[model samples]
Target: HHHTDPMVSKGEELFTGVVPILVELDGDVNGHKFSVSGEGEGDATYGKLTLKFICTTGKLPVPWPTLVTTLVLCFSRYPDHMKQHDFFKSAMPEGYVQERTIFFKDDGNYKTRAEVKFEGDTLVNRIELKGIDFKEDGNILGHKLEYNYNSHNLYIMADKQKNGIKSNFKIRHNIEDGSVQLADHYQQNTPIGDGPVLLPDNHYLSTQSKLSKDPNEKRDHMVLLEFVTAAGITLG
Candidate 1:
């Protein structure tokens, strides 16, 4: 005669590890500090980071041209890329969109550009950009004129690299309201805010970290160099 114990298996989930990287401000950016905070909190947690920006006291001094360019360029490419990666999307706030269009321009070659506008929430805002899209190394390549914008404050990224804070800026659209608006861009890679980021010195992820209750698991982590590229390690 033999006996057996009772056991049950309903489903299974896995995670390799969690990686956290820090950031630096490399421009005339003042009164604003950006930081990366969060973790891979198991099945009950969604893989994402939260950003909080504050004004020291008075209005933030972001150039107007840069502010305009960022708002449009950010939105123009935003809607599609967020979906391509297994990541989060913006609130987009209902009723702000007016029109969005993309066309080809020949600035030595057939480059790409987009036009976007909004109302109440985005109308007084309008923009036209002539973008040069091709294979690039860790930044936007070619003669692109967000130059009507701030060279130091530009944060352009790709689909595979949208998991962290890539670029940021602030605006005071209403002087009377004294309300300052912020554009804290998110992308992939830490300390290196967005992609295509520089390749890694060490890259990792696994299906084992989920098997135990451990702290500071190092399995699914990806380590990178400043200004290299993502050799193709996918993290959200």
Candidate 2:
């Protein structure tokens, strides 16, 4: 045992880990009005980041071949999210039954890109993800998605595809709004404080700021939040 100091204990009491924050978004997807909640570690200095989607009040605007894959797209992150649990890849397509389920088994070599295009009154946001691992029977070489965001009519369509036939999944969103919200939120066990800290205006959040030095930590209210929001509108 070493000498214990009262000052050391006092300093420790004032410290905090990354505060986890929740963001709830409200909008309509494919004519279905829904609300979404996402969560991630927060640094008041940086803002709010969502590691994954937590819950939904209605169906997601995108269409997946099966419920398992739908849930994967809704709540999981790339590469590692599905591997941790079998149920994430356990659902079968309609009228099809399998003795053993086909799952994503990846070595994690992949590239992702997002782009935006303007076609008359429509804004097309596309996402491409290539180079991944999957089972041979139902294997696909990643996927591409083109989202047609029609600002004039306030509706959207998702034209998604895999490598081939019977793999096209298209859906529509009649009212999709990607409004950004910023403010203080409540979190537990935060060292800086018990709840979320106040944030700067959206305009000032485009520049990166200090969050934390720890590898597992991220502070919010900085530049990362803006980019994450940009990605959300295109991908969500």
Candidate 3:
């Protein structure tokens, strides 16, 4: 009861694969049946992959805890992402042991060192992870990332909260070309009062402030209306 449905639904703007199955049943020996549909759209830097599916139940119960030998595979592409791991792992072709060292000249200083691992499978030839947590001197900032890649594009999903991915509203502003987008947006049935709009209960957002770092650019005044709730979780 603490979980959502067990059906699998995978989506990319260009393709979608949704499968609805019947797990519980009272029939004789029965197998599985499913259908898939999808579409795609994107450019060089960005695109979309989406899919949808439907299943018929002759007499079957959904198997939530899958334990089939190697017959079953949960569909996911994020693990193949190479946003930052590509070059990082290339620097170390030979498998690393416990630790490594780096020597710098000029001031004769030493930098930090840690580890990196390729996700999904080593045969995929992609960067899965790179990080340095243990340090000696300076206070190094820490960052964690979850990247997804396929034969087409690279994606990054990060900022985890405990076991769940953190949720927040976003207003992205691309400074390179002076553009903006309400890319990460959501609205629901919750309100605090009847004032301006911030008065409404909203999903807390943590995006880069858009106060304009460049003094030369003129600031255009505008109002933002948004909010967020539990937003519900996915069945994976």
Ranking by TM-score: 2, 1, 3
Error of 1 at 22 (Å): 1.0
User: Comparing 1 and 3 by TM-score, which wins?
Assistant: 1
Tens-place lDDT digits, model 3, residues 1-236: 11121111111221123322111111111122322111111121121112111113321122211101001011122122221211111222221211212121111111212222223222111111122232223111111111111121112122222111122233222222342212232212111222211111112211111111223423311111111112112235
Query: In terms of lDDT, which candidate is strongest?
Result: 2
lDDT of each: 0.22, 0.23, 0.18
For candidate 1, the C-alpha RMSD (Å) to the true structure equals: 20.6
Task: Please write out the lDDT profile of model 1 over residues 82-142, one tens digit for every residue.
Answer: 2222111121111112122212122111111222222332212222222233223211222
lDDT of 2 at 42: 36
Better of 1 and 2 by TM-score: 2
Each prediction's TM-score against the native?
A: 0.19, 0.22, 0.15
Could you say which candidate leads in TM-score?
A: 2
The global Cα lDDT (0 to 1) of model 3 is: 0.18
